[PDB]
Structures are given as C-alpha cells and as structure tokens.
Amino acid sequence: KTIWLQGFNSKYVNSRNGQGAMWCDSDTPQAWELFTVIDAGNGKIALRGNNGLYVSSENGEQAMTCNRPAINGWEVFDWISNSDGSVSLRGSNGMYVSSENGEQAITCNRPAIDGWERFNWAAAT
C-alpha cells in the first residue's frame, strides 16, 4: 500500500515534507517520495505522505501540496490504469495530476492526459 510515482522526466514525485508545493524532482525514491495509498471509498484514493499529511489537488488553483491534515474534498483521486501499465490521477475537479516535466511544481489543472500526466509506479517494498 506504499508506492512511489516516477514522472515523465524519470524523476520521482516528492512531498517536499509539506514545505511548499510538491515537485517531481527526486533522482531516487526515498522517504519523501513514498506515499501510502488510502482507499477513500467510491472508487477513490487518497495519498498520505512522509509527514502524515495528505496530498491535495488544491482544486487546480495553485500547485499541489502535501500538507492537509485530513482528507476532504480535494484530497481524493481517481486512479486511472493506462494501457502501458502507467497510472494517471484525476482530481475531484476532473483534471489530471501533471509532473510538469519537473520545470515547475506539480499541478492538477490539465483536462486531458499527456506524457507529463502519466506516472510509472511500484509498491515501495
């Protein structure tokens, strides 16, 4: 139930310990790159980061974060299994989580899946 997410730039999604926004900038998956997948009901998931806080879409109004203390909503996502075995994540605003190729903090404001919105994943163990 613990995973990492590897973005388009081959880097790993980084919680940044809840200090600022999340980035897809880590060269290897260590503690801040591991997320506990939480079954949130209704076929949705949430993600709890290294700091015990929850990943938020921020409804696409600003870059994604991992510092919400509880799940509401903007903290639940549809897990989309892609044909190649990658995953995409659709926030509750209907937009997709984007690595932004590591050039800016991760966002959830894209209406369609492109390369930056596809992640390789694996159970951390």
Residue numbers in the entry: 888 to 1012
From the publication, what sentences describe this entry?
Carbohydrate-binding modules (CBMs) are non-catalytic proteins found appended to carbohydrate-active enzymes. Soil and marine bacteria secrete such enzymes to scavenge nutrition, and they often use CBMs to improve reaction rates and retention of released sugars. Here we present a structural and functional analysis of the recently established CBM family 92. All proteins analysed bind preferentially to β−1,6-glucans.
To probe the mode of binding of CBM92 domains, we successfully determined the protein structures of the C. pinensis proteins CpCBM92A and CpCBM92B by macromolecular crystallography. As was predicted by sequence analysis, both proteins form a β-trefoil structure comprised of 12 β-strands arranged into 3 subdomains (α, β, and γ), similar to β-trefoil domains found in Fascin and CBM13 proteins. We present crystal structures for two exemplary proteins cloned from the genome of C. pinensis, CpCBM92A and CpCBM92B, in complex with ligands. These structural data reveal three distinct carbohydrate-binding sites on the protein surface, with one site found within each of three structural subdomains (α, β, γ). The binding cleft Arg residue in the β-subdomain of CpCBM92B is found in subdomains β and γ in both CpCBM92A and -B, but is substituted with a Ser in the binding clefts of subdomain α in both proteins. This substitution in the α site leads to a substantial increase in accessibility around the glucosyl unit’s O2, which may permit binding to oligo- or polysaccharide extensions from this position. For CpCBM92F and AaCBM92B, which both lack one functional site, binding is compromised compared to wild type CpCBM92A and CpCBM92B, which both have three binding site Trp residues.
